[PDB]
């Protein structure tokens, strides 16, 4: 495989990782749900993450995390897809403002605009 | 000698949680965070023995009180711990929460008296 | 879905941190050097690497055999960019022999038997 | 219970889990043999470790590691027990100069000469 297909390959084996709960690295307990992911990937994909993990950077900002939110920018890093629903995009959309993920944001007022 | 080397031991890893250095997870609770070693934890939490098990790190959003958790971790790492009726609620709640037996019989046996 | 171009960032900044050793789990110590890399990526690729590495946290490993080998297949594992060559194909086949990846393996001695 | 108490108790704990692997945090790979440990005990220990896994520093000298060595200087981390005999002395010696353990260093000396 070329770049593009290889890449494919190793971001749905590490959607496979997250989704089985095996060869993660973090776990957020937030609302009660534990989410398993890899720091690596949340540092691609948030300017935030990648602050936090690498330069243990603004830490108490955490506690905007919502479980509803939270699920769904994880969907996102590693499927490049949401499931967006009246119900759950303030939760989605204050997230990802923090974790700093404009298609996300985007995302949301594209819902709410309809 | 496995006494002073156990002090020895015990006293960096507090000096490490001070700093947050190898510190593998982290509590925000009422605006505050704590870091702490999972490991150490699981000495007397069953929480921490038997969650995140195979996670490098874990980021805790549902502690209930940041005072009732500082003093449980303060325990954890130096051994001091005083409980009175100010603030044996706090500590038991947290107690509760994270499994930790001897820490919990104690709090109760101090709510009961008139 | 543009999860082609999606994945295609994700490995980007994943080669830039690897090449930083940023948030990286696994180090390699072998012939004087050292190559830090995510395990979780390692597994994407390798049976070995993906059963070692369960359950397992941070991994020091001292045993691989030649930096030169274990540098293109860390660059393949993350770009998917390698050359064999009559040059490069011994070094290559080692590390690939010792982490028993049957492709790689099966390329070098093709490359190897070339008459 | 006291710090001497409450420390040895955690050390104890520590050593525990070392056994089953699970709660540990670091496994080396070295001669086809597997040790595993908790980064924050060895840099309590060990000021090359508490250098490597904070700051990075000097990551090539690990290249001077055996299995025989390490082993010996992991135990006596945990346990404050050494098992030194003719067979792995010199082994135990090589590891435990480049981590910067003068005890281990001392110790095998005198067996060495005496």
New interface residues.
């Given amino acids: ?14 959607n496979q ?1 997250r989704q089985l709960g ?11 749900v ?1 989410f ?1 992911a ?4 949340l ?3 948030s300017e935030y993450f990648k602050m936090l ?2 330069d ?1 950077k603004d ?2 900002h ?2 905007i ?1 919502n479980a509803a939110g939270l699920g769904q920018v994880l969907e996102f ?1 590693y ?3 949401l499931s967006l629903s009246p119900e759950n995009v303030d939760d989605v959309l204050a997230v990802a403002t923090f974790l700093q993920m404009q298609d996300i944001i985007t995302a949301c007022h594209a819902l709410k605009s309809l």
Same sequence: chains 1, 4.
């Fill in positions: 495989s070329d770049f593009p297909q290889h890449s494919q390959h190793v971001l749905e084996q590490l990782q095996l060869l993660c690295d973090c776990t957020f307990v937030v609302d009660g534990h398993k890899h720091k690596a990937v540092a691609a994909c993990f690498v243990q830490v108490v955490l506690d995390s890093m499927t490049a897809k």
